[PDB]
Design a protein around this ligand. Structure first.
Ligand SMILES: *[C@H](O)[C@H](C[C@@H]1CCNC1=O)NC(=O)[C@H](Cc1ccccc1)NC(=O)OCc1ccccc1
Ligand SMILES: *[C@H](O)[C@H](C[C@@H]1CCNC1=O)NC(=O)[C@H](Cc1ccccc1)NC(=O)OCc1ccccc1
Lengths: 306, 306
């Protein structure tokens, strides 16, 4: 038993991390087959950031201006192009460590593992959620740009996130691996509004089921509620609306625990209206929302990979 | 910026995980050079658990009774022995993926990453602390035994923990890689007392420095205190005594932030006596104690490995 915020094993992704340098800027790249992917602002100087014309800046670059380091191997760059906000460098050697992989654009509320890297070398791995407002609450220092987020399904790494920037509020923003930002953000050093975040209600419910499975059950009340009545409470507390699709997704956890979803909603309603009164649930004094229903099922069924 | 509970990149450890079977029992083993390490209770049946005579049980086994699976390769077992609570199986092939490694026995309050595994295959990775009472609060299902905890220093994996059991209270217990349990525990399916746990005070202070570094600073008060006066508060709240060795370890964080350690103790005193009043620190509504001072320095200096 026990329940922890667990990241995927990172070895498959470690073997794909390279160092990309163009001018004075060095960041991380992702090396799959004979292509290296990285944020296009690798070509920006200091002045360039406030108002970059990426097309004009890229035209001043040729293949030999991009230095790509894989540990200590050089890839020769034999072509380059810009795809949205990512640069794709064609190299002369396919990564011998390329895992089975896919590029996916995840939905808000979904979770993934981040392999934080600096100068092309992995530093650490942690799990997090794409917020409803398309930011992530990560741990990214200078040089972490180009670090990736991912999920694993048996042998297949599904890359979904590449890190580009920290907003002036200190939250993090980035793209899918086709270079399209999540959210309204642009790769410009300007102040940018993330907008109101909300709590991922279906994830909180999944975590409450995780808690029941693991013996923590004081919050189970002797009430039930309806969808419309619960959702009335959700909007007051900035929780995202609960749909029947959400109810269906919680089904297996409902069947395992013998607790109807709407009964669990009534417990969450009373938690939201009356607080936790200094108690804890799975070791936290807050309602946790970065576990999907699949995260929970996977953790207490012990699904493995490689 | 940002601060997250970060595990080490697990790739170096992934390549060492094997499946060990003896009779009906299958668990994880750790394959380094030509030796495989695993919990000795792999030789136990169901009845054996309550009162195992490990010496007598092991004598009924020969080399060919141990089935070792590395993905799909067999190691031939050419020798076996029991070292404290671990079994060491000599195999005919050295692991081609053996990292630079060491066996270390960690101190209570130190942290490490766990690579949770089932049937020899990695499932997930998370960070945690050896509690003062020599348990860990992990996530371990049936078949997770033999999963390891570890730290990395550049290229060297320092193995410090192998998982053996869940106590009836649901916390977790295990050994170093020489097979000596952390704590008073034995590998017997009996009820066993962990004893009173305490909060790792020096880790809480390191995390408060992490918070200041990352903009969270409401808790900084206009008080100071002394060691003896703070420690008086610590014992009332089951915090481990703060020593000058602890103060010295917090020095670099003191110098970075410009906050004397005893000034931070006075903030922690008022947090302990008056609660948090519904505020949060680095996203948590509780005082976090599973970050060492070195964890904090490493996270906000971006130290890398391999
Ligand atoms: C890239 O490694 C780095 C990662 C930052 C530093 C600390 N935390 C992070 O997530 N980010 C950057 O340097 C980029 C650079 C850039 C260049 C050209 C166009 C857009 C961005 N930007 C960035 O994160 O700046 C921080 C910031 C904070 C507040 C307002 C503006 C910018
Ligand atoms: C090994 O994979 C397994 C891991 C447990 C299961 C769920 N969570 C865990 O950490 N543990 C065991 O099966 C061992 C077996 C054993 C055999 C011989 C001597 C000692 C132990 N024991 C165990 O964890 O049992 C759980 C338990 C709970 C409460 C009281 C006694 C035992």
């Amino acid at each position: 038993s026990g329940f922890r915020k667990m990241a995927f094993p990172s070895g498959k992704v470690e073997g794909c991390m390279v160092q990309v340098t163009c001018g004075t800027t060095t960041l991380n790249g992702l090396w799959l087959d004979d292509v290296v992917y990285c944020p296009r602002h690798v070509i920006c100087t200091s002045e360039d950031m406030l108002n970059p014309n990426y097309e004009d800046l890229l035209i001043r670059k040729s293949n030999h201006n991009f230095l790509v380091q894989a540990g200590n191997v050089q890839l020769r760059v034999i072509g380059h192009s810009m795809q949205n906000c990512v640069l794709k460098l064609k190299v002369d050697t396919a990564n011998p460590k390329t895992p089975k992989y896919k590029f996916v654009r995840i939905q808000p509320g979904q979770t993934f593992s981040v392999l934080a890297c600096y100068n092309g070398s992995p530093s650490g791995v942690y799990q997090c959620a794409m917020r409803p407002n398309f930011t992530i609450k990560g741990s990214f220092l200078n040089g972490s740009c180009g670090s990736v987020g991912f999920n694993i399904d048996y042998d297949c790494v599904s890359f979904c996130y590449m890190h580009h920037m920290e907003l002036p509020t200190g939250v993090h923003a980035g793209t899918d691996l086709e270079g399209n930002f999540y959210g309204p953000f642009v790769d410009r050093q300007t102040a940018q509004a993330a907008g109101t975040d909300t709590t991922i209600t279906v994830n909180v419910l999944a975590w409450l089921y995780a808690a029941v499975i693991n013996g923590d059950r004081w919050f189970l009340n002797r009430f039930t509620t309806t969808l419309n009545d619960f959702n009335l409470v959700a909007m007051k507390y900035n929780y995202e609306p609960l749909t029947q699709d959400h109810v269906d997704i919680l089904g297996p956890l409902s069947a395992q625990t013998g607790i109807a979803v709407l009964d669990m909603c009534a417990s969450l309603k009373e938690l939201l209206q009356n607080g936790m009164n200094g108690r804890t649930i799975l070791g936290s004094a807050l309602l946790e929302d970065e576990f999907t229903p699949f995260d929970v099922v996977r953790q207490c069924s012990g699904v493995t990979f490689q």
